[PDB]
């Protein structure tokens, strides 16, 4: 258990939420930069977020893909869990779309392809369903390639047509079959892909109401509509991804991602080239240094950091000693 919190300099707040914070850090000994997610044990326990936290840890440790965030270290103190991950310097797609309103079909295509590559890997090679696709969880690396973050809602052990039970996800992104609450399969990820790609090309959610009651009714009952400037292949792709019956959805059959990969919207895409990062990103992040946070909301980066500075074997109900938090990537 070599690295500890004292091995890092804490530079800037990147993100914050009910469960904890994510800080831009420098490993002092190497000069390398990372995003460190710091969670308070007491909070995770109180909010029944333990299982999610442990799932993210396992999924990160078990996965290696161009478009998935890589984990460098995970470790714990008596009161905290720390995940030291590759820093996605280009920020959230949420940040960009908020400012730009829409992406071109070509730009949405590039992101869509990298997302499909990542999800295909998870489904096919890892038997993992992601369940939480949304613009906040889709980040850009310094070169402009996708990095998916936040694996806490994943389900492991989902092979082929195996089903899942848990009601989870983000309300505006929930698939009809999730809302029905009578079991669902891996095609929930393709609904999620539909929502994000719809947002990218159309500049709004496919279904929205500030009241969750009304929102859920729309998702279940309302036929999809598109702005009339949307091209025919994009309309076709989104229509297929946003079919309410997962059995009728693009990606919803035995071939899974391969059905999406073959859709005419992605005609000409060479999928091995996607994997190899041989497509030139349409937007290159213009960061001037390894610490430039221009693609992060000032609401976060303006905040002051004061990290709190024996107890190595302490294992309590409120602050447990958790398993698999002695990780350093080989």
Ligand X SMILES: NC1(C(=O)N[C@@H](CCO)c2ccc(Cl)cc2)CCN(c2ncnc3[nH]ccc23)CC1
Residues in contact with ligand X by the rule CB under 6 A = 14-17, 19-22, 35, 37, 69, 85-88, 92, 136-137, 139, 149-150
> How is the beta sheet containing 91-92 ordered, strand by strand?
91-92, 138-140, 146-148
Q: Does 194 show up as a binding residue in the annotation?
A: no
User: In whole angstroms, how close is the CB of 95 to ligand X at the nearest point?
Assistant: 9
DSSP secondary structure letter of residue 277: T
CA distance 245 to 298: 41
The residue among 76 and 137 lying less far from ligand X, judged by its C-beta, is: 137
What separation in angstroms does the CA of 326 have from each of 84, 125, 323?
A: 12, 25, 8
The residue among 91 and 251 lying less far from ligand X, judged by its C-beta, is: 91
Residue 265 backbone zone (phi > 0: left; psi -120 to 50: alpha; other: beta): alpha
The residue among 76 and 149 lying less far from ligand X, judged by its C-beta, is: 149
User: In whole angstroms, how close is the CB of 36 to ligand X at the nearest point?
Assistant: 9
Q: Does 159 show up as a binding residue in the annotation?
A: no
Q: Identify whether 132 is a catalytic site residue.
A: yes
CA distance 168 to 154: 10
Q: Does 22 show up as a binding residue in the annotation?
A: yes
* Active-site entry in 120, 132, 141, 189: 132
Q: Does 20 show up as a binding residue in the annotation?
A: yes
CA distance 220 to 245: 10
User: In whole angstroms, how close is the CB of 182 to ligand X at the nearest point?
Assistant: 28
User: In whole angstroms, how close is the CB of 167 to ligand X at the nearest point?
Assistant: 19
Q: Does 18 show up as a binding residue in the annotation?
A: yes
Spell out where the chain is interrupted, by the residue before each break (C to N > 2.5 A): 309
CB-CB contact of 119 with 130 (8 Å): yes
The residue among 120 and 150 lying less far from ligand X, judged by its C-beta, is: 150
* Residue ranges of the binding site for ATP: 14-22, 37
Active site residues: 132
């Amino acid at each position: 258990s070599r690295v500890t919190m004292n091995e890092f300099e804490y530079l800037k707040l990147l993100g914050k939420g009910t469960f904890g914070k994510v800080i831009l850090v420098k490993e002092k000994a190497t000069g390398r930069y990372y995003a460190m997610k710091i969670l308070k044990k007491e909070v995770i326990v109180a909010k029944d977020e333990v299982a999610h936290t442990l799932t993210e840890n396992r999924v990160l440790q078990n996965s290696r893909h161009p478009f998935l965030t890589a984990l460098k270290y995970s470790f714990q103190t008596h009161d905290r869990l720390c995940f030291v991950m590759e820093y996605a310097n280009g920020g959230e797609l949420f940040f960009h779309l908020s400012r730009e309103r829409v992406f071109s079909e070509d730009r949405a295509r590039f992101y869509g392809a990298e997302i499909v590559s990542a999800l295909d890997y998870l489904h096919s090679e890892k038997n993992v369903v992601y369940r939480d696709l949304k613009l906040e969880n889709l980040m850009l690396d310094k070169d402009g390639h996708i990095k998916i973050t936040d694996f806490g809602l994943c389900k492991e052990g989902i092979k082929d047509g195996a089903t899942m039970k848990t009601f989870c996800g983000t309300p505006e992104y929930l698939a009809p079959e999730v809302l029905e609450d009578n079991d669902y399969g891996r095609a929930v990820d393709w609904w999620g892909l539909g929502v994000v790609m719809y947002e990218m090309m159309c500049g709004r959610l496919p279904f929205y109401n500030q009241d969750h009651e009304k929102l859920f009714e729309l998702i279940l009952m309302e036929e999809i509509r598109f702005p009339r400037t949307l091209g025919p292949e994009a309309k076709s792709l989104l229509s297929g991804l946003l079919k309410k019956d997962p059995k009728q959805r693009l990606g919803g059959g035995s071939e899974d991602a391969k059905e999406i990969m073959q859709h005419r919207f992605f005609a000409g895409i060479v999928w091995q080239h996607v994997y190899e990062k041989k497509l030139s990103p349409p937007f290159k992040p213009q960061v001037t240094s390894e610490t430039d946070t221009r693609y992060f909301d000032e609401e976060f980066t303006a905040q002051m950091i004061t990290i709190t500075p024996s107890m190595e074997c302490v294992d309590s109900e409120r602050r447990p000693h958790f398993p698999q938090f002695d990780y350093s990537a080989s």
